[PDB]
């Protein structure tokens, strides 16, 4: 049995905002994401979930909006965010996707929670708008 196809990759390069996040904030969040990427518990979240490699045919039926650290980093670099809260939203989406599919009690979900904790701690220092 086949499941749903992989959604189009983000960002939609066709709907960027003309007023992205100022460079000072964007530079801070980019450095924050790179810091998370160096976390050893971030390894599974570096790249998009590979539903064929992981043999989870229905992953996209349950997770219609996948997210991962490389997509967040690309959305910052390509100027796709309008507000730092959207960065936090995408990080939360990555974590919620993981818990939704794998269950709150799975090891991978604990790793998701741990890198979310690091991310939030770093974000405490984000410069104002
Ligand atoms: C977050 N997440 C998952 O949410 C996920 C989704 C479905 C099935 C298993 C998992 S654990 C998981 C594993 C990898 N990657 C690996 O385990 C690597 C690549 C294949 C085996 O080592 C990447 C993402 C991921």
Residue numbers in the entry: 190 to 318
Paste lines from the article:
The most active compound was dibenzothiazepinone 3, an analogue of 1 in which the cyclopropyl, oxadiazole and pyrazine groups are replaced by smaller methyl, carboxyamidyl and tetrahydrofuran groups, respectively. HTRF and ITC assays showed that 3 inhibits CaBdf1 BD1 with low-micromolar affinity and three- to fivefold selectivity relative to human Brd4 BD1. The crystal structure of CaBdf1 BD1 bound to 3 shows that the compound is slightly rotated within the binding pocket compared to 1. Consequently, in a structural alignment with Brd4 BD1, the steric hindrance observed for 1 due to the larger Trp81 and Leu94 side chains is largely relieved for compound 3, explaining the reduced selectivity of this compound. (Both enantiomers of 3 are equally active, consistent with the lack of interaction between the BD and the tetrahydrofuran ring). Liquid culture assays show that 3 has little effect on the growth of C. albicans strains expressing either WT Bdf1 or Bdf1 inactivated in BD1, but significantly inhibited the growth of strains inactivated in BD2, consistent with the specificity of compound 3 for BD1. A dose–response curve revealed a cellular EC50 value of 35±7 μM, corresponding to a 20-fold cell shift relative to the IC50 value determined by HTRF in vitro (or sevenfold relative to the Kd by ITC). At this concentration, compound 3 showed relatively little cytotoxicity towards mammalian cells (EC50 >100 μM). Our chemical screen identified a dibenzothiazepinone compound, 3, that selectively inhibited CaBdf1 BD1 and displayed antifungal activity against susceptible strains. Specifically, strains expressing Bdf1 mutants in which BD1 was the lone functional BD (mutants bdf1-bd2Δ and bdf1-Y425F) were sensitive to 3, consistent with this compound's selectivity for CaBdf1 BD1, whereas all other strains with a functional BD2 were insensitive, arguing strongly against a potential off-target effect.
BET proteins are chromatin-associated factors that regulate transcription and chromatin remodelling. BET proteins bind chromatin through their two BDs (BD1 and BD2), which specifically recognize histones acetylated on lysine residues. The BDs from C. albicans Bdf1 (CaBdf1) share 31–46% sequence identity with human BET BDs and 58–66% identity with those from ScBdf1 and hence are likely to bind multi-acetylated H3 and H4 tails. In conclusion, Bdf1 BDs are required for the viability and virulence of C. albicans and can be selectively targeted by small-molecule inhibitors without compromising human BET BD function.
